[PDB]
């Protein structure tokens, strides 16, 4: 059994890591698929994002990180899998997630499972973490130390 946990992960948050953990506890293997967007965004480049995920997940031996591009469903079936795990947090556009799940099931037969991230991590997102951190707000309890490290470096 396997699941893919896709995202842009710019940077990975403890909400993500909470979801990676739950997928890794319930599936034999987990792949974190880093899907970079077209926009010249965002903050960290591709090796940094990988680095940040790897460093935050060394305690999950059945999880690995891969760069994706193209349809999530093409990548998923690439890994020889048929399931996606996605975290739900406050502000998640769940309707659009649901639309995409129904499209992905229809076009490739892939299932999407949704899981509510833990209350304490339920209000971080990559974008909101970046905004707040770069304005001198303290988000450090909500991101992994490998992320807090590069955030602080960026601050200068």
């Amino acid at each position: 059994t396997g699941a893919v946990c896709p995202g842009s992960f710019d940077p990975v948050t403890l909400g993500h890591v909470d979801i990676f953990e739950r997928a890794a506890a319930q599936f034999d293997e987990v792949v974190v698929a880093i899907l970079v967007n077209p926009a010249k965004t965002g903050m960290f480049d591709l090796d940094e994002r990988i680095a940040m995920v790897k460093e935050s997940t060394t305690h999950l031996p059945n999880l690995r990180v891969q760069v994706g591009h193209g349809l999530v469903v093409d990548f998923v079936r690439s890994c020889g899998m048929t399931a996606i795990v996605k975290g739900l947090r406050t502000g998640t556009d769940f309707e659009y997630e649901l639309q995409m799940a129904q499209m992905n099931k229809h076009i490739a037969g892939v299932d999407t499972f949704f899981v509510a991230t833990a209350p304490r991590y339920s209000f971080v997102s990559s974008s909101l973490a970046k905004e707040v951190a770069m304005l001198g707000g303290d988000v450090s309890e909500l991101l992994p130390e490998p992320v807090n490290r590069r955030l602080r470096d960026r601050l200068n």
Copy 2:
């Protein structure tokens, strides 16, 4: 007696046709108003979008297709109509549709009727259809043949 069905229809989907059919069965006449957003393009020029809607609606003799300009409620009242029919699907920004429905009532006395599109077409949207076609996946069952016909050429 008459209803307008506005949209960018870039391109028209079978979700839209579903709604056209409900509009056309329940009102004496229907006007599909194509309103081109100055921002974007889009993928299909005005003429194509007209042709696609026409060709997908020959089975509805009481429906006609018009290029809309300016304030939507202004277009509606210039057609002599006071009704708008709008489809609801998975991922519809319903809170916003409600706001516009209220604004439109207030400014011009135009009523908005909301209808849930059929479940099999509930996850298609023009943009998701495009993204997926762009990326290789198959959305032909969710789009009318005049569209698929023009989609697979506009991918060569």
Copy 3:
């Protein structure tokens, strides 16, 4: 063309009346379907509800009032119609309404159209009006005069 406006109207409100007025301007005729339900303890008896509805709708000559038993889709087709018109107000269980709409389309081909109630009557409900009224609060500007007359009577 034709629409049915179903409900228990216990009692009818100016929210309902707004919806009625809007179905009536838009469809050739409207039937208000009063649904007796075995047996949600009601406040007013069947003919009181008929009466209040009738007395509050004297201004709409293409509207008439009937009792419905069983399936709303049976009642609708009984009237030679194929459309239902439902108001949306604050607190509407829209997800439930959507479920029933989809089921109703599937089992009988009947369309459900939803309309946003006028903002000033967006917060009335038969339930809340009853609860507030029976505790001596002033809901009179939210109900038709015929209903207000009956309400003061119960209050005694």
Copy 4:
């Protein structure tokens, strides 16, 4: 790798079966936990519900059926599992599901996965099916044949 699909299943529908199938494809073992309520009693007794589920899942050899009592999380941990799979349909009380998911994680470490049932099955529920069938409506495409058989008997 195991998941519990809990519910009252009075009767099981094809939306449920869609969920069972997906659970069964993604986990090594699945337990359908039939959880009754010390209220009323529903439509079918425990044997009928067990039987209906069994007869509808003969094609999922890694799924078994069991009566449950008490906290869902106690039963889950009884099965040696730490996961729950639950379907989403229109209109699932999703916010209440989420509350329960968070409570369940907190008191027992149990994860809940939500997955959207197929569009064609997304408007059935046990309640609505029973309501519609007993009033003479055709829900047979939405329920397994072992369920349809028994409904037909009730319609006697």
Copy 5:
């Protein structure tokens, strides 16, 4: 400047106390209104409910506890106040709370301010806390100690 926080508080939770603290910080005075509906029954009589709120709010010198009677806004105005403070949690019927807020403004000029309860207390509710306790589970970290204390004496 005063606010009322109304409820059945059967029993008071730390979700509630979180909300009291916020009302007590932002308003000079704060009346906790305990309203026991006729169908009150119930895991705690009025006296115990009062005691529990009293004992859980000694750290809030500007809050006091009273029995509410009748129209919620009648009671509010009788306290000389025109503000209600209502807590939001996962599972809150927010659409109905909105309806009531607007009815409340309309009838009595009472404003309702909604506040999100802290994430750690965002999934507790009086009935869930009882249900779980009743079935053996541990919710002691989500209830204040005067509640936990009296909760064990049900369980004997």
Copy 6:
């Protein structure tokens, strides 16, 4: 006691004014925080927005207007306050608002209270007002006369 009502107020609406009036009746003072935005195009320059807010608030002596930069919670604490009051109208992205509320509480101890805008102004927004007005529509009943004054001029 004190609250901050933040926004880009481009331009201020009677929806805003209603919220201002309500915070001012309930807190000792209110500060309107006009937030600079380096992205979002925008229509009126900072001084016009201040002016329009000032001129539409002459009747609330305990309200004043300031420009904010950076974190809302920094602005709030800057004013010696710990409370933010936001309006809810139809179309508000409440989920996003709730995410920020939780984030703001966590990084700074600041509370966010939400209050439902009056029904008559429940469908104006700066964006929709601007879009309607610049296409020749009549939104004058939904904005303060000082704004209607400036909007006429732009309509040129």
